[PDB]
Symmetry: D3
Subunit: 237 residues, 6 copies
């Protein structure tokens, strides 16, 4: 066990799906997993292990922001034998053609956090995913007839940024989605020698006003979950 | 009424105590508050409002890391009329005679996060508590006959630093406690015009490797809560 | 002696008042201290030692800027047994309610200097005062019937900044007064194990353009001196 | 024509392979392209256009270093209708399991250059390749019976670094290969709205200075060119 | 032989003139050097050695940008006994009163590269020329009737820079010319114990001014080469 | 008049010699100047005006450190029509071959200060002296049978370095001497359009046991003053 996960080596599958919201981890375990068992509840950061089409799969919230998710992913990797991490989150969009409910696959993650410069002697560490995992998610998405873009995300430290112009810079450089985790998870993966992938669904268009019914947000969340789970199976071959 | 807090104006007291552990926030509500009612449960980040010795007080989790607490503290200040935030957290000690369960008060907070540099044109912003809140906490702790050292905290982005030597630097500069939120909450306090104070209980020693349990962090750090709660009463004068 | 102070251990009190202007030190010694003797004149940086109401007390100029005061504060601490340093200075205001000749107490000090980053492996060190010293100053002013605000100062390297926009940021984040030394003295204090506090008298307003003369700065900011000297007696318990 | 390219629109294919060495571009043109024609010789930086399995393809040197390749790739993109750039180079390995003659595909490229911080408001831009081009080069390599590793390159400004310790940092976060261009190219691609990819063969292992005979270097160089070309054809469909 | 120069000790004079363009190096050899012979052609980077008025001189292109010339200049100093490097190039002007075909001598070289910060522990290294070489060039030019401007160059990493506003900053601080190598060469000079100088002719004006008019000098490219060669002769005396 | 100088336009010559120590300025005026008159004493920063060999010359202290001297040089340039500033001080030698007697002329000045980065958009400004003043000083020195050394100074913010990591680095890149002002004055000069020079005598030399009797140090200090004063007369031609 660790100070943030009341569990032991074995309670987790070698692949963990991670939404920000612990309750979405509960929903995911209750809906797409068989024989789900709750394996962590320290700080209410719910985690579950079960099976998807006969493959052992875990799912556990990471909380919001680079520091939070850095703790959980690091601990999972070094203390619970985890090999792959798939974050299933939401993101804000800055591109004109990226619409709500669109799926995005962070091949890379830009960030305004210092965590990677701390790791990397103040140089530019390109926080990227594991390629096979990105390929798996792309191929799974196709098999499900879901459209996804593969590119850069931007993991932000401040949800409420005093730096509004930055969004114009993100758009200029083709950032597909703005969330709060990817660059930190990718930094942990590189530091501790595991593989990670971030998939998001666009839940709001920054500098725009339009919404979606609760029914649509769910199906879209389900689609993300399905892309994620199915890509694991492709990953296993 | 806000993106991470499903509550309405009035649901929160004008003062909110905030551990990072939403479950500590539950314990505190159940143990120190009367007539407490749950006022938030979004993302399992439990918030409660009740009374202490007659005074309306709220307690709510803020999650781990600067990005996580920046969100909740921003939203309480700008949208729930919150005037005071008292962070009540845990911390790692670096000094040889700061021991387990010592209470320390963050008058200022160092950080390796970039959020204040971002706010402050890449210069050094001294992240500090409201003085009067510090004085209320000092006088409250004296009346209870609980020791409390006042000084600098260090708000870390990485619980697991790659840079072991930073700890030696923190020690050299008299850092009383290593945690993950203080400098962040102080940034939001200054930015949106509120008052903040961080009080922490030492939950592990980075050198002797003494540490507490998750169960102990969640429910046995009560000196700091008495201090925070009595300090609010001194504030009302 | 030390390279910038021609005196011996014992010549200074354990508490040393330090304005930037040595001529102000002279005025303070001749006006507030009994039986004052000059104890330094290296580089014209006059330092004196007298008694204040029976308490042995020193006052000495520290020059303009962080590099200047960092030299004197270091030398006093390591070679003259000085335990407390109270900088008594002048500062420019940016806040609309802050008037000329207002006394401000620097609990914290922001800076655009690189010295603390040099100290703190390029992270954010919160340059803070000693708490008790702050509290003493607060209580001493209350006893004297002198108003004083406690909070953040900004320690500037460039008195004539090309970045006029930085004042707008200082104001937004509640900076009480702009000077050139506080963050550097707090840095030295932390590095060498002593305690410091900066009290300033507002000598010009950056927005209203209202100003005082050199001669007024040199001798007429006496509120802060009474507060400083009386706070020392309080600190003696 | 452009300042550094004396040719006209039409003279380049929409895809340009780019080795650092202009002489190797001539070699690629003579070895792989039918009816190759020289289309640039400004600054001796040879560019050629021909056909490969009936497909118009170009090859041009980009010189050494980020600022150099940035110049050429930019002009190609804005004035020659070039949609894809494939850098083909050699790289140094820092990982022990990464052997001489391995093909390394840079899905992302780290760097100690400031060019991208300049572009991205001093934040971390994750310099990445176009995903499809990565996947094409992977599929092409497989059909050729070759296993290419996909991950991060490090793009160095200094071939002769004063700081040998940086290599251990690169090793610790999984850098596959060390070159001097990729991150700059990825930077240009995102700024001006085109697609890039860098493929390298490992020529030396930086730690033990262990290297390879010209015969095996010519061989693996050709395999790299074969992969790059076959990648374009997969991309076309 | 070095990894970028196929020659042997002796093949190069102890003074090397360097243009960006290898073809320019070719032009210089045939125009000014008697008994000119080619000593390198690796990567088409033409180098030559002949005599100018019986003085053994070499001329060799350095390629474009700080990383490219840093390679060549390092290898020349460390393995070929080169003592002096004289960069001869073109530069753009940002000041109104600097006119076309003015000759600018870089006694200093500002930069937006990170190479010197990497060398200098992230501080400000002032990348400067050798003082004797500067005066030799001033004196050489005066003898020819040209008033060379002595001051700062700016070594840009991006010929196509995203930040136009920086040019206003360059104008404000008196930068004489904008090229791409000088700071890097001055960096190498200092690191490896050699002497360097960059001389440039003003070949255009950067950006449109309602105050830029000045005039035009008759100063040819050939004139700049004369100044450089003659300045070597002065240095020998 | 300004807040740091109680004088009026006309009270200063258009050239000002500036030691750090104001008593030294008094010494300089009394020794080399005819009809020396005190023109400033605000903050005891003694400034004097008189003539040397019929030529109007002023001399005034600038205090210790970049921030102090920046205030005075700016004010002299923008308010007293000063055109040339010659710093006359001392420095420590890091290079073995730079003896404890030598005159060093700072053609450029490195620094660990942030003041130029604040001026130059966080890039590298090469803080340089005006060339002609450099040449005037070399000639004044030569005529007095003194061989000045021309090169880089290092301008330190921290006389008492926390770790002293930079001394070996200064030695590696050829820094002639260490003081605390040069880079700052040069930046003011660049910023406000005047001309500066720093001259220093080597007052301490690391790693040896070199001895000087005061007959040798007074001769050498006077030597520096003559060099500076004679350099002005040369510049007047
Ligand atoms: N040694 C340590 N280092 C960093 N953070 C913490 C904490 C607090 O607990 C959380 C991470 O464990 C986070 O909220 C932080 O503030 N306790 N002990 C700590
Ligand atoms: N508007 C202003 N900005 C910066 N510093 C000061 C001061 C202080 O006074 C001195 C310069 O006037 C120096 O010590 C500085 O800290 N007064 N007014 C100021």
């Amino acid at each position: 066990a660790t100070p943030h996960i009341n569990a032991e080596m074995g309670d987790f599958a070698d692949v963990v799906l991670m939404p920000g919201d612990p309750l979405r981890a509960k929903y995911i375990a209750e809906t797409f997993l068989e024989d789900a068992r709750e394996v962590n509840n320290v700080r209410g950061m719910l985690g579950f292990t079960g099976t998807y089409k006969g493959r052992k799969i875990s799912v556990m919230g990471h909380g919001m922001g680079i520091p939070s998710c850095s703790i959980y992913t690091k601990e999972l990797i070094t203390d619970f034998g985890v090999k792959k991490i798939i974050r299933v989150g939401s993101c804000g969009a800055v591109l004109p053609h990226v619409k709500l409910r669109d799926v995005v696959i962070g091949m890379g993650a830009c960030t305004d956090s210092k965590v990677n410069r701390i790791r990397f002697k103040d140089h530019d560490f390109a926080a990227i995913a594991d390629f096979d995992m990105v390929r798996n998610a792309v191929d799974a998405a196709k098999a499900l007839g879901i459209d996804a873009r593969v590119g850069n995300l931007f993991s932000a430290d401040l949800f409420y940024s005093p730096d509004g112009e930055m969004f114009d810079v993100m758009e200029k450089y083709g950032i597909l989605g703005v969330e709060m985790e990817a660059a930190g998870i990718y930094g942990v993966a590189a530091e501790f020698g595991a593989k990670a992938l971030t998939i998001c669904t666009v839940s709001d268009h920054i500098r725009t006003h339009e919404q979606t019914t609760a029914a649509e947000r769910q199906t879209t969340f389900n689609d993300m979950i399905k892309i994620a789970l199915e890509s694991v199976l492709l990953g296993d071959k």
